[model samples]
Target chain A: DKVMVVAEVRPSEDVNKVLSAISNFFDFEKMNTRKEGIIDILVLEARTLKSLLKFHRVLRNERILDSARKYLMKGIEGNTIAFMIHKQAAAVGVLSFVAIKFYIEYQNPKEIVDWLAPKTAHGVPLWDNPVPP
Target chain B: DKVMVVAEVRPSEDVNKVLSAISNFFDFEKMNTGIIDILVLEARTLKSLLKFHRVLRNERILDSARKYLMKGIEGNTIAFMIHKQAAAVGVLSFVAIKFYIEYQNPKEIVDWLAPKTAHGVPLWDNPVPPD
Candidate 1:
């Protein structure tokens, strides 16, 4: 599976700081900067599930598994799962929700969500499903 | 005259960077950080705006600065945005470190800060009225 991450570098924002924020939670194999109208956009592509390891860990650390799972599930479409995280939170090495879009390509997107933020029972994971092989 | 500058500390932005950006241009008598916003207040004089005025001249953006300053004038108040990122680097960019100034003669203040220019030269020798 592969993942694509995209974040906008606002005119008022420093490009390096925005990049730092994104990199705090994601590992990418390829990166590109492009303009969309007047705004600069940073696009990152990762070729494996490993890129999601940090994000998956953060979901558990922040203890927002249930809410994160809902958002991730809402983004499922065919072989893709998409969601967004707050860029501001990421900049400070924290996770809040906004629109730094993440598009994940996987054969079983549901399995990906379960791995990132599994269903919980009594505030604990019902089961830990390993990343899909 | 009084001026108040405020900038929001975004979740992604470093608070110290935002404060540094403001201090690069303004010198206030009082400072406060509330929740996620930094506020600097200056009262009784426009001295706080000197650095900003100088930056306009130094950056050779007096004409554009005059236009924006005028655009921000209403009655006895002037308001405008300075780019936070640019300010952090000690540069003047027009984007969002929101500035609010209250003066009896705001037009004159604008003229003094960034007067009309002739071939890129200021048209007047500091038109601001003495306090």
Candidate 2:
């Protein structure tokens, strides 16, 4: 499995602060920063589901499983699941949906979505979906 | 002269980054961050505006700065808003970090910061006031 996270550091934004914002909710084993036009792009790469653990925990704690699941489902394509979280919210340790993109690659993308944000019943998850072995 | 700067640190905003934004252009003698949503910085000398003075010139926004500064004048006070996000990265923006300054000579201060200009050149330089 692989997880890639990307964010833009605009000329009027602090690059380090944007990185700190991403770190608040995601972990990456490798990363790259490159200039694109007038903006700086930050790309983070991780080789395992561990990189998404923080994001998963946040979804559960914030009780936004349904919305998160919707976003995750919308981004599924073949072996990839993608979505975005608000960069500003991440900066402040909150999970609000906006535009810092997350791309995850796994054999079963739906299963990955289920693991990250499972279906819920009356605010409780219907079932805990564990990572496939 | 006294300078007061106030900015909102929204729930989605980083407080330290916001502080850094304000510090990029202005210096303060005292500050209040007790309120979670609002930050207030105060300065007692014109020295507080020196950095902001330099930014206006460096950014080549002297004419625009002059217009905004002149419009902000009311009695002994000058008030304007700067872009908070831009300031975060050390850029000067004329558009959310609110500044309210009380000076014995507000016009003079404005002139010093952004003097009258002719086709991108300053007509004359006003000597910066001592701290």
Candidate 3:
């Protein structure tokens, strides 16, 4: 169980752009696709929470998740986050937690316990206090 | 949030042994610590709640969890375990509802809610098939 990242990316005008953009941060190999009727989900995986954090960093730094704005979201406001416990000697047991969040929003408030997942959900930096160009 | 799993593992007889074992399923590098006096807090994180729920869905976990907690005051933090377990229950059950809503008609969503496990396991006999 450790930390893994899963995402359900909606079909885009150019699906390739979205996937390729995401690949910039995550490993395309560990990723998988599952279809729920017409919707296609891109299940992304990160080996560590640090890596997961990095992936989110790009989405924020590059503004890639901005795509969600034009595309309607599914599963709660955006995507659902799941935490699980599987095979391990250090900690042997089973448990899980999930939070469905919106990765990009026009304007919104922020908070915690959801951990980095929520931070990643809000993706890009807030426009509330923009740096001078 | 894309997906993140968080857990609070108790201080076992052998902390090194326990954490080392868990390294098998998770990467130790990304792991972090949270402490309160003598309590050795072990938090586990992951992406898919599906996998997380899969672990919870397994009846054995709850059984062992209860058994582990019932030992006594020093038998591990009963409050923490129960709280975390309740959290898992709440999230998983809600997700089950979400899954139901996603797959069935509006009427069936509510109908299927209680009758199905978070993993979609039917609580009783399967729904009567349409003629």
Candidate 4:
């Protein structure tokens, strides 16, 4: 099974406003923000499955974004890139092909996929091998 | 004295828009967009840092007015703090006989790090570069 981690702190969400909103619930001792706007990170390390689930539930079902909307939220309604990396041990680097799909649930599917292909490449090392004839 | 890292990938750069523009130069063989908004890493050694600085110097990313984050020295964290000596020099002669180069865009870096919001002075307000 693949695990999905909701890890990004919103970009344009007025770092101060986010701090004030979550201040009462979470302690500032462990949360670091001196690096806001650049590396605005929130590392949630849960001790147990149940504890992790609870946090996940709040983010997904508890309207976390709505409550925190005292700050601005971008209205660009695009596919939520929920990152999940799945892999298994292969005895060696075998030539096994994996079927890939772009789960873009919006308009202009072809255009979206074609455009994202290269932009994603610049950010990370994506295409390690050239397409075979 | 100090080195700052520009590591965070802009979250709203329209992942799609960025993909389209940089696609010609990159192949989507290994990128995973699921974690696109978080943990964008760009680690550069001294030599490569110079190359990157040159690219950004000539590019429009800065001219378009985007702020990149900066940090403290390498191998240093806030965990080394004492009880209440907030003013204590946490950094010592951590290294011996070591000199480092500092490259900064002066204005943007200052605007990002200014103490007060209103005090941020934009340095390159459309400076018509050396005509």
Candidate 5:
């Protein structure tokens, strides 16, 4: 099976919560506990542009907010990328996973199992454990 | 500031309609519902395949299909996507726009003022009366 990719976004403040939530999404799909090595979590470069405060404001406005969330939601729901944005005064984290089965259906045939792998703030793999056999 | 990006998915059949729904998405954010040329609608190659039948099934099924449909209406709202399958289903369309005030496309807002702009479906522009 081809490897599945995961991405996570972590923003600095409540304004940045959306970033963290998006990051959480990738954390899972990239490394499903049930199936080791089947997925690849791609950590994204977390960004907190000095101007994001102002940018977040624009994102929170009615038409603008809805538009952004609509895109973010559709992205996650459609198995695109995830995003964390503020809407309705609350920081919203859009978590998503991408699975492409070109000629087959994607099935997590394995049962319940969970594992958590921590990564660098830059969204890189953190080697917290010893190398494998 | 950098340019923002858009993504879309388009399913091949009624079974694949979801993919098309996704395609309609990029058609707008990349292209724009109106006010053409300013936006760049990245055309995605449409694909139809035999394997999708099973893949879509798994997507719709994962302790899946039907989750939190939210509010401004009814009870508490979480959120989820089930993906209708080979099951009796009509194709649905969803068009999305991504605007970044900061980076900005360095372009004008979509010209909803015109025709065949993008968003490909002419949905958001439809008169409330559905004329």
Candidate 6:
């Protein structure tokens, strides 16, 4: 049973970019991987999930994205809110790590900053930090 | 030091509904519940995580919501594939128990499903099943 095992360390700032990296990494439309055996992609791990969650807190501390955060937090329920330490953080950490890596590697910091220009409502800053303002 | 110890057993399916029962039981947003003293809601316990995870899998098995699943499984990595059962399901199972109670008062099914689901990725599912 021959198979292509890919260990991808994708980087991203948002779901769009992270997903874009995933799509670009593999030819989802024309992938030649097996459908049975594991292809190596697993869900959130404790250690990495821990790092990712820390990063997410950092981002939230920095108050980066609201709409996107809301999107991530859509279906969360019961005890999930309590275990924010692992599950949520690990999940978001992965996305943020992917985005951060991608943007830092390929895209410039200014571009990253611009994309993360503190989302606003009614042309007013939701957060007062103001992109290091 | 005023506190009323409440062990609510409501039951329901969706997250919003479960949260409602939680709120109704203790005016989380309004009434006065202490910040400490372990109010129970312990971050996706073993049984709840498994059941909800089962529901999630069942729904996914039925191809119910790819978008939602994608949203749920956003950030994953490493040899986690080698250990999928305990960490994901057991955690989910406990959460399911709390929520299920808020709506239906079902006893404890985390005992039923959690063990099996966690048996696969057996990290904490290593027989004890991570709570």
Residue A2 lDDT in model 5?
Answer: 24
Q: After the best TM-score superposition of candidate 2, give how far the Cα of residue A26 lies from its true spot, in angstroms.
A: 3.1
Model 4, position B117, has a per-residue lDDT of 26
In model 4, which runs have C-alpha deviations exceeding 4 angstroms?
A: A1-85, A88-133, B4-48, B70-131
Share of native interface contacts recovered by each model: 0.30, 0.18, 0.00, 0.00, 0.00, 0.00
Top DockQ prediction, candidate number: 1
Ranking by lDDT: 2, 1, 3, 6, 4, 5
Give the DockQ (2 decimals) of all models: 0.28, 0.19, 0.01, 0.01, 0.02, 0.02
Candidate 5, residues A89-121: lDDT per residue as tens digits? 222332122221111011321100000122233
**What lDDT does the true structure give each of the candidates?**
0.80, 0.83, 0.30, 0.26, 0.25, 0.27
Tens-place lDDT per residue, model 4, B3-113, is: 322121232223443333222212222233232243221222223223323333444233322322223222322011111111011111111111222333433332332
lDDT of 3: 0.30
Residue pairs in collision within model 4: A83-B34, A118-B23, A119-B18, A119-B19, A126-B29, A126-B30, A127-B29
**Per-residue lDDT of A95 in model 2:** 88
TM-score of chain A of each: 0.93, 0.93, 0.34, 0.22, 0.21, 0.27
What does chain B score (TM) in every candidate?
Answer: 0.88, 0.91, 0.25, 0.22, 0.18, 0.23
> Model 1's lDDT to the true fold?
0.80
In TM-score terms, which candidate is top?
2
The ten-residue window of minimal lDDT in model 2 chain A covers A9-18
Error of 4 at B67 (Å): 2.4
Residue A1 accuracy (lDDT) in model 2: 76
Q: In angstroms, give how far residue A23 of model 6 lies from its true place.
A: 18
**Cα lDDT tens digits for candidate 2, A1-133:** 7889988876446677777888878888898898866568899898888777788889889999999888889988888887888777787788887558988888888888888788899889988876554
Estimate the TM-score for candidate 4. 0.17
**Residues forming the 10-long window of minimal summed lDDT in candidate 6 chain B:** B77-86
**How do the residues A37-105 of candidate 4 rate in per-residue lDDT, one tens digit apiece?**
433544322222232233223332333333222111221144322221111100111111121111113
